[PDB]
Design a binder for this molecule. Structure first.
Ligand SMILES: NC(=O)c1ccc[n+]([C@@H]2O[C@H](COP(=O)([O-])OP(=O)(O)OC[C@H]3O[C@@H](n4cnc5c(N)ncnc54)[C@H](O)[C@@H]3O)[C@@H](O)[C@H]2O)c1
Ligand SMILES: NC(=O)c1ccc[n+]([C@@H]2O[C@H](COP(=O)([O-])OP(=O)(O)OC[C@H]3O[C@@H](n4cnc5c(N)ncnc54)[C@H](O)[C@@H]3O)[C@@H](O)[C@H]2O)c1
Ligand SMILES: NC(=O)c1ccc[n+]([C@@H]2O[C@H](COP(=O)([O-])OP(=O)(O)OC[C@H]3O[C@@H](n4cnc5c(N)ncnc54)[C@H](O)[C@@H]3O)[C@@H](O)[C@H]2O)c1
Ligand SMILES: NC(=O)c1ccc[n+]([C@@H]2O[C@H](COP(=O)([O-])OP(=O)(O)OC[C@H]3O[C@@H](n4cnc5c(N)ncnc54)[C@H](O)[C@@H]3O)[C@@H](O)[C@H]2O)c1
Lengths: 329, 329, 329, 329
């Protein structure tokens, strides 16, 4: 009659149910699942949201993971296909289906992509008025813009996902030759997320000492610092002898990391380059922006890119825009 | 002219500064400092608040700790003596000066205490309209009520602090004889926080098996299960051959733990016993209440206390109220 | 000539490279990948080992995950197919290929399994002399024995994996009806890991109060407490409308949790039931054993199983052994 | 007869009790207590050791803290006054009594210090053959040497404590003016730990861009970058209007952080400067050394200190040695 009830009574007060911190995920699967595994075990949102047009998977996904539900502590995990559930989320991220096939054409992914991605737009924005969007979906930089202009949430609240991992692998491969690790070995590569991403090796140092200096100069010869980068670009390629990426999931987790908590750190991502170098026509690509509480702490960090590198960044924008131009909106 | 500025520019967006998760502390020192050390390194509040009538200490306190500021990550730590700073906090806790002197009279602490504590009231409540109050201050149970009725925030949002540690030490001393630890060894002692706290050994078990059962019956003879408890009460006493308590700080941290995050777990604390056992006259003491987001998830858990124990709890209320009656409001 | 070198010199001391805490994984994939994601982001082993006969995947696996390598901190992650790399690990776990196909016959998995699993044996044991083995592989209970007797490491160091999650989902589904969660809601189900797993509801309680008591009696009628369990068994089934399990990975992580650290907590697993209830013939199944540093802290916890339940456990052993008997060693 | 026993039986195996990861603390109190609070709640050692000639305090200390024992998870905490308990520890740290009195003479602390510190030596070394020593005790740099030469453990295993916090406060105060925080704002100050500590502002940058550059040049005028540093030195001073330091405890925690785990990161500390700049006579002071598993990963990082700064470091060594010379061994 009141079993659960008689063991657990209430008080005369009654501050009704509610919540506070929200997390929403689009695309229950690899990128998603990986993200979920990362953000869900790390601990962030009061309640998390998963939503797809794959009834089946989600059940199994939301349910089983929920299983562990108990190995850590979150509260609630929701699923569905009507972007009704979330209504009011801070940390929102999307992916979608369209992954590289060994062979290239990551850019091709532009045509076949807007199809589904577009519609996602009206849904995710309407209910997440106070939400910030992170896109793990292909074409970190590119797709970002579409939704943004599409939705038109003031920049700072919109984040693509782009060049986050770029660095890490770069920073990481880096420590191997050093005998120190990704940690202190701070190495930077900034662009947009695909073979060609300019590298700013001029920012190579350890501790309080600048690297180039220690060695002197660079790539055009040397021992192929050149290579380091390329297979950062190439990185994508081989791996999928495994089929895809199933856990760069940390990067995305880190990215929103700053956001949700609101700490103001300097990290890659994709914003708007309109009055900077050559690029002058909204070229949402990979660039330092600083993030925080429901916004990208409105600060894009300016640095002096060596010309070699300098143009490289401008370059990207140039090559990048080609694809949008077509529009197919 | 714009040094910091030229390195760090902004965007055309501009979601002005603000924040989200708040923590406020009263009494920069042991209990406080310990709490701070606990809550601040554990990671919870976006920004933390410290406030006392000890200008000096606080500087050194807020400043130095702030020092580490960098060994973990919070954002901002504020100090002052005008309860203006916090304006709008969720997790608020108070202590105050008045600690036991080897010899007893923890209750004496009632007269000399309301003096300062009272005034604290108007201040902390006026600005923390949406805040919940945890009292590490002496007389967990007792003092609680004063402010509450004083302020009159609907129960669920007001928490004393009382019998939290009671259990742990009890649960803890417990594992020593077992060869398992506080973890799984779930042992309960519930009352109000001072020598006399009734113990409900009937709730002694491990895994899925009830203890008493395994041994059979109990204290009146045995090997002094009796003792276990008493020096749980006594616990206070000796230690101060060290002067006081400088780190039960976890208990308080745990207590609010449920709160801030809002998870709904079952833990001791001090509420209102008005229509339960004998006690019928607002006897805010040590009892299970379940806590959550800006409220004590309005549920006090009912259990069948053996008569021996049964009365013991009623008892406490009886002996406890003596002190208030006098009022001196 | 000495670039990396001139930036980083050494001292006259020289305590050569080495390490300390080791983790080894068999089966780079779901269970594995999930485990890895769990144990690797949680933080445990100084260095981790992955090893399969799937050159490709592992590259992509070890490499990419390694990618994040930098989002947390471990040190080294190794891969190969010669069980040479690990030589000397504490926390070793295996899975293998052979997952349920919607339809049942998890037991069928016995024939098709020993084929590959057997050989794994000589390899993993020869080099991990001081290692403990956890089997996420199908037939938690069953397979366990094979290797064990096979290897013959003294019990306490051998753990199957079996009924870990059993509980959690049970404990978990549990909190839904309560309004409290897996946390405090301690609910037990112990057996071996497949439809039929006996449940000991007699161990149903919250706080310090026993449940059955609160409601009184049980299943044979009621509101189907019966069901709760079955789809704990069924749990497996549906989900794979997703294909399999991709993240119960926590359970395994938790399981070794106690181990690696060596804390002595009470948890399910699979050991040897030889002189307990009816079972008398080495029936390695799901049962409480307590785990710790390179051993299962040699303690299996005895409790009084209601007859209804009582036999149920005995039962399992009976039905379980059928499969081994055949031997096919 | 076997109460605890009958609930918890053992197995025929029996891998006797033991342990693995060890932590030892000298000076139960502020620095110590703070450390303990940090290292003990953070989670590191299997078992921790506290040891003093203050029977009383320790009881209360070890006991009460132990209290929380249950709010996190370690295993065992030991106390005594015979350096017998630890026998075999990795992470060992000492402090001792002799703190600054508002007025200066931190160096005076040399005479009054060796008295007690000396004897500590034979004890702590004899039993911690495989232990590394961190000195939170005054004169980070100075005292370090005494014990070292005293004990003579090969450098890499001996760490003073010196300039750790130096940076943080420096790095930290830093972010205030920036609008980013200690995190990314990597700012370096390296010397020995007392007013005069040279600063290498030439290593001022954010992201991948060097600072000085952005502003151009420096201190001799400017807006007092000079000041920033000095009250880094001064930092010590005022605070003690609070009596001392009660929680820089993180720095020490971080310092050993690298050690215990063995990760190889670049951090301040005190080593031996014998064949570097001017200093040529064992001047154990504040300098980057890289730390790891039971050793300071034998690497001291070389960088080009501007002359202004250049000499400053040499300088320190010069002024520093004065005090030892006297010897009073
Ligand atoms: N942007 C980046 O920095 C970055 C980094 C990693 C991966 N990725 C992107 O993420 C992808 C992940 O590939 P994968 O192999 O792991 O999985 P997958 O592409 O096969 O699965 C895609 C999933 O996206 C979600 N999705 C797709 N269509 C959707 C729709 N209309 N509505 C809502 N959700 C929908 C669903 O969860 C779906 O199962 C890559 O191929 C790439 O597009 C991007
Ligand atoms: N309630 C409980 O469960 C529980 C458990 C532990 C300790 N305690 C209480 O906490 C005390 C801590 O003692 P201690 O030795 O650690 O330190 P302490 O009593 O000497 O310092 C008390 C501090 O309380 C704060 N305080 C005092 N007067 C105040 C005022 N008017 N406004 C604002 N803040 C004020 C200040 O930070 C002050 O320095 C105990 O004596 C007891 O009262 C209670
Ligand atoms: N024991 C339990 O409690 C429990 C719980 C969850 C899942 N599981 C088991 O784990 C399986 C995971 O299935 P999945 O779909 O996630 O992945 P999967 O079965 O398709 O991949 C199996 C993987 O096991 C490893 N493996 C297989 N053969 C091996 C060999 N000869 N040497 C070394 N490693 C080898 C490889 O990493 C391989 O890719 C389930 O089907 C079941 O067998 C068991
Ligand atoms: N080296 C550094 O980087 C650094 C940074 C912070 C503080 N400190 C040092 O730490 C001190 C801490 O001062 P405090 O006010 O916090 O506390 P305190 O000086 O009053 O207490 C000192 C404690 O050191 C231990 N100790 C002293 N004599 C000892 C002996 N013979 N054997 C074993 N242990 C003994 C005891 O725990 C004792 O209570 C400072 O004054 C300074 O010496 C150094």
């Amino acid at each position: 009659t009141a079993l659960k009830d008689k063991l657990i009574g209430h008080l005369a007060t009654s501050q009704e149910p509610r919540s506070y911190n929200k997390i929403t995920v689009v695309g229950c699967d690899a990128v998603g699942m990986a993200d979920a595994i990362s953000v869900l075990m790390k601990d962030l949102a009061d309640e998390v949201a998963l939503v797809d047009v794959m009834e089946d998977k989600l059940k199994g996904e939301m349910m089983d993971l929920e299983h562990g539900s108990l190995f850590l502590h979150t509260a609630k995990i929701v699923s569905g296909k009507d972007y009704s559930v979330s209504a009011g989320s801070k940390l929102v991220v999307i992916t979608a289906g369209a992954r590289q096939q060994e062979g290239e054409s990551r850019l091709n992914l532009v045509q076949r992509n807007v199809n589904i991605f577009k519609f996602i737009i009206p849904n995710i924005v309407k209910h997440s008025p106070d939400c910030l969007k992170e896109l793990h979906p292909e074409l970190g930089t590119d797709k970002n813009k579409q939704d943004w202009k599409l939705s038109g949430l003031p920049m700072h609240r919109i984040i693509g996902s782009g060049c986050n991992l770029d660095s890490a692998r770069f920073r990481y491969l880096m420590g191997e030759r050093l005998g120190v690790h990704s940690c202190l070995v701070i190495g930077w590569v900034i662009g947009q997320h695909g073979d060609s991403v300019p590298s700013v090796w001029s920012g190579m140092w350890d501790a309080k000492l600048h690297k180039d200096v220690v060695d002197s100069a660079y790539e055009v010869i040397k021992l192929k610092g050149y290579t380091s980068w390329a297979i950062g670009l190439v990185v994508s390629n081989p791996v999928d002898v495994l089929t895809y990426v199933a856990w760069k999931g940390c990067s995305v987790a880190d990215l929103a990391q700053t956001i949700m908590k609101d700490l103001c750190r300097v990290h890659p991502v994709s914003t708007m380059v309109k009055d900077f170098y050559g690029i002058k026509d909204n070229v949402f690509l990979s660039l330092p922006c600083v993030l925080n509480n429901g916004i990208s702490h409105c600060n894009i960090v300016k640095m002096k890119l060596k010309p070699d590198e300098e143009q490289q960044l401008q370059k990207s924008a140039t090559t990048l825009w080609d694809i949008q131009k077509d529009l197919k909106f």
